[PDB]
Amino acid sequence: DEETLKKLIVRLNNVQEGKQIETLVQILEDLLVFTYSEHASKLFQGKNIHVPLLIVLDSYMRVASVQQVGWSLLCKLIEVCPGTMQSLMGGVHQLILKMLTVHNASVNLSV
């Protein structure tokens, strides 16, 4: 529901710990993946859902949980929200190249 979405976005923009944010991010990816409706594509397309996530992923390069789940979450967001591409540019390219360079020496993060 929209209330659950507000809860998830609050959590994602509130707690600064690696475990909590990664778990709630994966839960939001699960919600987004489903075919029930376009609840994830709420037309807001606020970057605050994923900008702190990529900030944590780049800053905490040793945190493999976020380094593994944030890629999936952003993939689900792009594939679900049609406005993700337009909202990205006008950036995230620096963040994604930093993620690839920092600790993506393992197969799971590289794929």
CSV table of C-alpha atoms in Angstrom, one decimal:
chain,number,residue,atom,x,y,z
A,1,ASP,CA,0.0,0.0,0.0
A,2,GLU,CA,0.9,3.7,-0.1
A,3,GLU,CA,1.4,3.7,3.7
A,4,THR,CA,3.8,0.8,3.4
A,5,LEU,CA,5.6,2.7,0.7
A,6,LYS,CA,5.9,5.7,2.9
A,7,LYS,CA,7.3,3.5,5.7
A,8,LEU,CA,9.9,2.0,3.4
A,9,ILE,CA,11.0,5.4,2.0
A,10,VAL,CA,11.3,6.8,5.6
A,11,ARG,CA,13.4,3.8,6.7
A,12,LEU,CA,15.6,4.0,3.6
A,13,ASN,CA,16.2,7.7,4.2
A,14,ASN,CA,16.5,7.4,8.0
A,15,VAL,CA,18.7,4.6,9.3
A,16,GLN,CA,22.4,4.8,8.3
A,17,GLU,CA,23.3,1.1,9.1
A,18,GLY,CA,24.3,-1.3,6.5
A,19,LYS,CA,22.0,-4.2,7.5
A,20,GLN,CA,18.7,-2.2,8.0
A,21,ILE,CA,19.0,-0.2,4.8
A,22,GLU,CA,19.9,-3.3,2.7
A,23,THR,CA,17.0,-5.3,4.1
A,24,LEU,CA,14.5,-2.6,3.5
A,25,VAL,CA,15.9,-2.0,0.0
A,26,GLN,CA,15.5,-5.7,-0.9
A,27,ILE,CA,12.0,-5.6,0.5
A,28,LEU,CA,11.2,-2.7,-1.7
A,29,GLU,CA,12.7,-4.5,-4.7
A,30,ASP,CA,10.4,-7.5,-3.9
A,31,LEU,CA,7.4,-5.1,-3.8
A,32,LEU,CA,8.5,-3.5,-7.1
A,33,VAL,CA,9.0,-6.9,-8.9
A,34,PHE,CA,5.4,-8.1,-8.4
A,35,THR,CA,2.8,-7.8,-11.1
A,36,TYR,CA,-0.2,-6.7,-8.9
A,37,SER,CA,-0.1,-3.0,-9.8
A,38,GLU,CA,2.2,0.0,-10.5
A,39,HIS,CA,2.5,0.9,-6.8
A,40,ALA,CA,6.3,1.1,-7.1
A,41,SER,CA,5.8,3.4,-10.1
A,42,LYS,CA,4.0,6.0,-8.0
A,43,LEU,CA,5.0,8.7,-10.6
A,44,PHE,CA,7.0,10.6,-7.9
A,45,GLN,CA,10.3,9.1,-9.1
A,46,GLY,CA,12.1,10.7,-6.1
A,47,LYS,CA,15.8,10.1,-6.2
A,48,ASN,CA,15.9,10.2,-2.4
A,49,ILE,CA,14.8,6.5,-2.5
A,50,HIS,CA,18.2,5.5,-4.1
A,51,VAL,CA,20.6,8.4,-3.7
A,52,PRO,CA,21.3,7.6,0.0
A,53,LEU,CA,21.5,3.9,-1.0
A,54,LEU,CA,24.3,4.6,-3.6
A,55,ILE,CA,25.9,7.0,-1.2
A,56,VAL,CA,26.2,4.2,1.4
A,57,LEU,CA,27.3,1.7,-1.2
A,58,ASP,CA,30.1,4.0,-2.5
A,59,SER,CA,31.1,5.1,1.0
A,60,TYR,CA,31.0,1.6,2.6
A,61,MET,CA,32.9,-0.3,-0.1
A,62,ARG,CA,33.4,-3.2,2.3
A,63,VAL,CA,29.7,-3.6,2.8
A,64,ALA,CA,28.9,-6.3,0.3
A,65,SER,CA,25.2,-6.6,1.2
A,66,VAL,CA,24.4,-3.1,-0.1
A,67,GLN,CA,26.9,-3.6,-2.9
A,68,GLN,CA,24.8,-6.6,-4.0
A,69,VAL,CA,21.3,-5.5,-3.4
A,70,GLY,CA,21.5,-1.9,-4.6
A,71,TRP,CA,22.2,-2.9,-8.2
A,72,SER,CA,19.2,-5.2,-8.2
A,73,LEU,CA,17.0,-2.4,-6.6
A,74,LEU,CA,18.1,0.2,-9.2
A,75,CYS,CA,17.6,-2.4,-12.0
A,76,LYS,CA,14.0,-3.1,-10.7
A,77,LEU,CA,13.3,0.7,-10.3
A,78,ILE,CA,14.5,1.4,-13.9
A,79,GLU,CA,12.6,-1.6,-15.4
A,80,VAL,CA,9.4,-0.7,-13.4
A,81,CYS,CA,9.3,3.1,-13.4
A,82,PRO,CA,9.3,4.4,-17.0
A,83,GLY,CA,10.5,7.8,-15.8
A,84,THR,CA,13.7,6.5,-14.1
A,85,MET,CA,15.8,7.2,-17.2
A,86,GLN,CA,14.5,10.7,-17.6
A,87,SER,CA,14.9,11.4,-13.9
A,88,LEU,CA,18.4,10.1,-13.9
A,89,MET,CA,19.8,12.7,-16.3
A,90,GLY,CA,18.3,16.2,-16.1
A,91,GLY,CA,25.1,12.0,-12.0
A,92,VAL,CA,24.5,8.3,-11.2
A,93,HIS,CA,27.2,7.4,-13.8
A,94,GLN,CA,29.9,8.4,-11.3
A,95,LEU,CA,28.3,6.4,-8.6
A,96,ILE,CA,28.0,3.2,-10.8
A,97,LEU,CA,31.6,3.5,-12.0
A,98,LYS,CA,32.8,4.0,-8.4
A,99,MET,CA,30.9,0.9,-7.5
A,100,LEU,CA,32.5,-1.1,-10.3
A,101,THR,CA,36.0,0.2,-9.4
A,102,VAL,CA,35.9,0.1,-5.6
A,103,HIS,CA,35.2,-3.5,-4.7
A,104,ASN,CA,33.5,-5.2,-7.7
A,105,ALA,CA,36.4,-7.8,-8.1
A,106,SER,CA,34.0,-10.7,-7.4
A,107,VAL,CA,31.7,-12.4,-9.9
A,108,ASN,CA,28.5,-11.7,-8.1
A,109,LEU,CA,28.9,-8.0,-7.9
A,110,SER,CA,30.4,-7.8,-11.4
A,111,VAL,CA,27.6,-9.5,-13.2
